[PDB]
Amino acid sequence: GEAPNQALLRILKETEFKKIKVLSSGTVYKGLWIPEGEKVKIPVAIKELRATSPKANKEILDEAYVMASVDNPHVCRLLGICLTSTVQLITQLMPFGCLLDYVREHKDNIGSQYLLNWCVQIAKGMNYLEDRRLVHRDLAARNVLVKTPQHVKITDFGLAKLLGAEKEYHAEGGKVPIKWMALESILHRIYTHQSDVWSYGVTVWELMTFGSKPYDGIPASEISSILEKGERLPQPPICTIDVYMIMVKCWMIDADSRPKFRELIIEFSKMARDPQRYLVIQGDERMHLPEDMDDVVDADEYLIP
Amino acid sequence: GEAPNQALLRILKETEFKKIKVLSSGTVYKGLWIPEGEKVKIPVAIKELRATSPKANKEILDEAYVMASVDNPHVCRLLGICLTSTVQLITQLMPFGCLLDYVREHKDNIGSQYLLNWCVQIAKGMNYLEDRRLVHRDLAARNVLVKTPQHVKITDFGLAKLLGAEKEYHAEGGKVPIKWMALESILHRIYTHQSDVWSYGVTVWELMTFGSKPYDGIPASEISSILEKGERLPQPPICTIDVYMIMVKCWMIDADSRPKFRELIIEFSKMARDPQRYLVIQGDERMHLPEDMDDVVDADEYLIP
C-alpha cells in the first residue's frame, strides 16, 4: 500500500480489432485483436459501453485500473482500452463463458477431478489477489470464467477495492449479492480477504451442486437472520464430509477462524490427488470434457510490446 | 483409507435447542433439541466454546469430523454443530455422566455382571473403531459415558486419529495421559489399535478397582522406567486370575502379543455368562442399579432426517 503501482494501461486503436459476433446485452462482443504489423491474431472479448453517462465511464475506467494492476494465471487478463465515443474494455476471450452456466450445461460430464482442480485454481487466484491487498467483494461462480475446461480465471472487478497498507474496507450503499456475503459484511458493511473466503465457500457449494441457487427460497432480507440463527448451506450429495467441512469453516462467524486461501490451496490440492475419495459422483470415470486462424495466439502467450 | 467418507455433518439452528442447566466449566450444558415441526424432544449435551481462539475452533471441528464419522451403539452419537459466535458441539445426553465417577459414587451397588458387561461394551466399541481404522489414543474410564447403568459408550475423540490405508500414527508433542499409554507410545510416540488395547487394559483395571488412580504414587516421568523394569498394575482384589491375566496380556511389550479387541469381546463375554465365577464381590447378589416429557425420544431412537 506504499508501493507505487507501475502497471501499464494500454490504449488500443479501434482499427486494430475486428468484432466477430455478439455475446450479450453493457454489450460484450467477441472478436480479434490484430496489433499492426505483428502477425498475430488475439481472440478477445470487447465490452463497449452502450449513451454515455459520466458515471458509466467512471465505473469502466475503475475496472480497467484494477484489471491492469493484476497479473496471475488465475485472474482475468486485461489487454487494454479503446477511447472511442463509448469506452471499450478489451479482455482475453474466455471461450467457454462463466463457470456457473458451464457446470449447469455440463453436469453429466463433470468429474471430481475437474471440480477439485477448479477449487484449487480459484483459491490460487484469490490468494494472489490477497498478496496484492485486493479485496474482490463479488466472488461467485458467475464471476469465474472458463478459458478451457481445465483452466478458469477470476473475473468482474466491478466492486473490487485495493486496500491501503487499512485493515478492512467500509462500503457505502447500493446493490450487493447478499447470498454470497459474509455476516460481518451484510451487517456492518465490512469487507476483508476473510469475507472473500466466505464468498469462496458459497462459490464451491455452487460448484458442488452443479449450479444450484444458494438459499433458493429465502428472500435476501432474511439471509441475515438465518445466518445469525447458526444455519448454513446444506451438504451437497456428491460431497464427502471432508469437502463440506471446508465450506462450513469458510462460514464461521469469527472471520479469523475461517481458513486462509493459501490453506484452501493446500487442502483442495491434496484432495485433487485422489478425487474419487473426496467427491462421489456416478459415472465419474466415464466422463470427458473438451476463418483462417494460422496466426492466432492466446493472450496468455502474447506478452508485453 | 481409500473409501470416501460420506458421513453427514448436520448444522443445527440455535433456536431449535433449549439449554436447561449447566454440567461443567470449555462449558457443557444439558438441554433439549427440538427439530422444528417434528414433535420430538431429544435430551442433549451442548459443549459451547468459551473468547474464540482460531485454535479452539479448529480443535472442536476436528472432534465433530471424527464423531460424525462414527456410528455404533458403543460409541458416542453426534447430533450436529451450531455455528454461532462460539461453535457448539451437540451430542446425545449421557445422564449418568462418565464411568469413572460412576464406579466411585456407586461401588457398594456395582455387581460383577455390570462390571463384565461394561468390559464387553467398551471392547465392542473399540473393535468398531478399529474396523474404521480409527486409533482413539485416549481410552480411559474418564472417557466412557453412561447412558444407563446397563449401557456405556466411548467418548472424547479429541486426540483420535484416522489412519490411512498407514500402519501407525506418529505424534508431535503436547500433553498426553502417560499412565494409560502403551510403552512404544511413551517412548517412540507410536500409536496403534494395539496401543489402544494397552489403554483398554488400564481402563478395565480402573473399573475393577472401583476408580483407583493407576500408579497413584509414581510421577509421570517415572512410569516409563517402571514399565521397562517389567512391572505392571497390581491385581485388583475382586479379580480372579482369569480376569487379571487378560489385563496383564494387554500390557505385553510386544504390541502384537497383546490381545485383539475382537478377542477381548469373546473372553469377557464368556465370563459375563457366569460373573460370580470371575469377579468376587461381597454382597454381589444383593445389588441394584437404576417438565412435560411426553414427546421426549432418546437420540438412539431418532434416526436420519
Enumerate the domain spans of chain A. 1-93, 94-290
Task: Report the alpha-carbon distance of residue B236 to residue B107 in Å, rounded.
Answer: 14
Contact A127, A261 (CB under 8 A): yes
Angle formed by the axes of helices B241-250 and B193-208, nearest 10°: 150
Q: Please, what is the end-to-end C-alpha distance for chain B in angstroms?
A: 27
Nearest to A240 among B4, B58, B82 (CB): B4
Task: Return the DSSP state at B47.
Answer: E
* Chain-chain contact of B5 with A241 (C-beta, under 8 angstroms): yes
Task: Report the alpha-carbon distance of residue B48 to residue A88 in Å, rounded.
Answer: 54
Task: Report the alpha-carbon distance of residue A271 to residue A276 in Å, rounded.
Answer: 9
Structure-determination technique: X-ray
> Element (H or E) spanning B101, and its range?
helix B99-106
* Chain-chain contact of B2 with A277 (C-beta, under 8 angstroms): yes
Residues with Cβ < 8 Å from B305, sequence gap 6 or more? Answer: none
Among A116, A241, A242, which would you mutate to test the B interface (most chain B Cβ atoms within 10 Å of its Cβ)?
A241
Contact B2, B10 (CB under 8 A): no
Task: Report the alpha-carbon distance of residue B268 to residue B116 in Å, rounded.
Answer: 6
> What is the CATH number that goes with domain B1-93?
3.30.200.20
Task: Report the alpha-carbon distance of residue A110 to residue A290 in Å, rounded.
Answer: 11
**Gyration radius (Cα) of chain B, Å:** 20
Listed resolution, Å:
2.5
Contact B90, B33 (CB under 8 A): yes
Residue whose entry in the numeric block shows the C-alpha cell 485493515? A167
Nearest to A235 among B8, B69, B83 (CB): B8
What is the CA angle A28-A196-A239, rounded to 5?
95
Cell of A203: 462459490
- The single residue of B101, B131, B138, B156 carrying the catalytic annotation is B138
Cell of B253: 511389550
Task: Report the alpha-carbon distance of residue A158 to residue A132 in Å, rounded.
Answer: 17
- The single residue of A62, A71, A101, A138 carrying the catalytic annotation is A138
Cα dist. B100→A52, A270, B27, B103 in Å?
A: 78, 41, 20, 6
HSE toward the beta carbon, residue B16, CA cutoff 13 A: 27
Amino acid found at B119: C
* Chain-chain contact of A278 with B4 (C-beta, under 8 angstroms): yes
> Which chain B residues touch A230 with a CB distance below 8 Å?
11-14, 82-84
Residue B146 pairs with which residues in a beta bridge? B152
As a dihedral over the C-alpha atoms of residue A226, residue A227, residue A230, residue A232, rounded to 10 degrees, the angle is: 90
Task: Report the alpha-carbon distance of residue A24 to residue A94 in Å, rounded.
Answer: 14
Question: In the β-sheet with A78-83, what is the strand arrangement from edge to edge?
Answer: A17-22, A28-33, A42-48, A87-92, A78-83
Q: B167 by DSSP, 3-state: which?
A: coil
Nearest to B85 among A235, A244, A254 (CB): A254
Among B5, B12, B17, B90, which would you mutate to test the A interface (most chain A Cβ atoms within 10 Å of its Cβ)?
B5
Residues with Cβ < 8 Å from A225, sequence gap 6 or more? Answer: none
Give strand ranges (E) for chain B.
17-22, 28-33, 42-48, 78-83, 87-92, 134-135, 144-148, 151-154, 161-162, 169-170, 190-191
> Number of Cβ pairs closer than 8 Å across A and B?
67
Contact B45, B90 (CB under 8 A): yes
Contact A154, A76 (CB under 8 A): yes
- Chain B residues with CB under 8 Å of a chain A CB are 2-9, 11-15, 52, 54, 57-58, 61, 64-65, 68-69, 82-85, 87
* Chain-chain contact of B85 with A276 (C-beta, under 8 angstroms): no
Fold of A94-290: Transferase(Phosphotransferase); domain 1 (1.10.510)
Amino acid found at A42: I
**Residue A137 class from Cβ within 10 Å (0-12 exposed, 13-18 middle, 19+ buried)?**
buried
Q: Please, what is the end-to-end C-alpha distance for chain A in angstroms?
A: 27
Which residue numbers in chain B precede an interruption (C–N > 2.5 Å)?
25, 50, 165, 290
For the four alpha carbons of A92, A81, A142 and A192, in that order, the dihedral sign comes to positive
CB burial of A229-258 (b: ≥16 within 10 Å; e: otherwise) equals bbbbbbbbebbbbbbbbbbbbbbbbbbebb
Task: Report the alpha-carbon distance of residue B131 to residue B143 in Å, rounded.
Answer: 20
Residues with Cβ < 8 Å from B238, sequence gap 6 or more? Answer: B112, B208, B279, B280, B281
Contact B136, B126 (CB under 8 A): yes
What chain A residue is nearest to B62 in terms of C-alpha separation?
A245
Angle formed by the axes of helices A261-272 and A241-250, nearest 10°: 170
> Which chain B residues touch A242 with a CB distance below 8 Å?
5, 65
Task: Report the alpha-carbon distance of residue B74 to residue B154 in Å, rounded.
Answer: 6
HSE toward the beta carbon, residue A303, CA cutoff 13 A: 5
Known active-site residue A71: no
HSE toward the beta carbon, residue B226, CA cutoff 13 A: 17
Residues with Cβ < 8 Å from B120, sequence gap 6 or more? Answer: B265, B268, B269, B272
Task: Report the alpha-carbon distance of residue A55 to residue A70 in Å, rounded.
Answer: 24
Contact A182, A255 (CB under 8 A): yes
Which residue numbers in chain A precede an interruption (C–N > 2.5 Å)?
25, 50, 165, 290
Q: B87 by DSSP, 3-state: which?
A: strand
Cell of A188: 456492518
Contact A295, A39 (CB under 8 A): yes
Task: Report the alpha-carbon distance of residue A272 to residue A13 in Å, rounded.
Answer: 43
**Residue A23 class from Cβ within 10 Å (0-12 exposed, 13-18 middle, 19+ buried)?**
middle
Task: Report the alpha-carbon distance of residue A154 to residue A140 in Å, rounded.
Answer: 9
Nearest to A254 among B11, B57, B61 (CB): B57
Residues with Cβ < 8 Å from B175, sequence gap 6 or more? Answer: none
Task: Report the alpha-carbon distance of residue A171 to residue A195 in Å, rounded.
Answer: 13
Task: Report the alpha-carbon distance of residue B109 to residue B117 in Å, rounded.
Answer: 15
* Chain-chain contact of A241 with B7 (C-beta, under 8 angstroms): yes
Q: Give the largest Cα separation in chain A, rounded.
A: 63
Cell of B9: 455433518
- Chain A residues with CB under 8 Å of a chain B CB are 229-232, 235, 240-242, 244-245, 248-249, 251-254, 256-257, 274, 276-280
Cα dist. B69→A237, A240, B7, B63 in Å?
A: 16, 10, 5, 10
* Chain-chain contact of B65 with A231 (C-beta, under 8 angstroms): no
In degrees rounded to 5, what are phi and psi of residue A13?
-80, 135
Which bin fits A304, alpha (ψ -120 to 50), beta or left (φ > 0)?
left
Nearest to B83 among A230, A274, A276 (CB): A230
Task: Report the alpha-carbon distance of residue A119 to residue A208 in Å, rounded.
Answer: 10
> Which chain A residues touch B65 with a CB distance below 8 Å?
241-242, 245
In degrees rounded to 5, what are phi and psi of residue B214?
-70, 125
Amino acid found at B163: L
User: HEC profile for chain A?
Assistant: CCCCCCCCCCECCHHHEEEEEECCCCCEEEEEECCCCCCCEEEEEEEECCCCCHHHHHHHHHHHHHHHCCCCCCECCEEEEEECCCEEEEEECCCCCEHHHHHHHHHHHCCHHHHHHHHHHHHHHHHHHHHCCEECCCCCHHHEEEEECCEEEECCCCCCEECCCCCCEECCCCCCCHHHCCHHHHHHCEECHHHHHHHHHHHHHHHHCCCCCCCCCCCHHHHHHHHHCCCCCCCCCCECHHHHHHHHHHCCCCHHHCCCHHHHHHHHHHHHCCHHHCECCCCCCCCCCCCCCCCECCHHHCCCC
Task: Return the DSSP state at B84.
Answer: S
Contact B208, B236 (CB under 8 A): yes
Task: Report the alpha-carbon distance of residue A176 to residue A224 in Å, rounded.
Answer: 13
> Element (H or E) spanning B231, and its range?
none
Cell of A234: 446444506
Residue from B16, B35, B44, B82 nearest A231 by CA: B82
Contact B69, A241 (CB under 8 A): yes
Contact B74, B132 (CB under 8 A): no
Amino acid found at A216: D
HSE toward the beta carbon, residue B245, CA cutoff 13 A: 5
Contact A251, A198 (CB under 8 A): yes
Cell of B79: 447430533
Residues with Cβ < 8 Å from A256, sequence gap 6 or more? Answer: A194, B54
Residues with Cβ < 8 Å from B180, sequence gap 6 or more? Answer: B138, B139, B140, B198, B199, B202, B203, B214
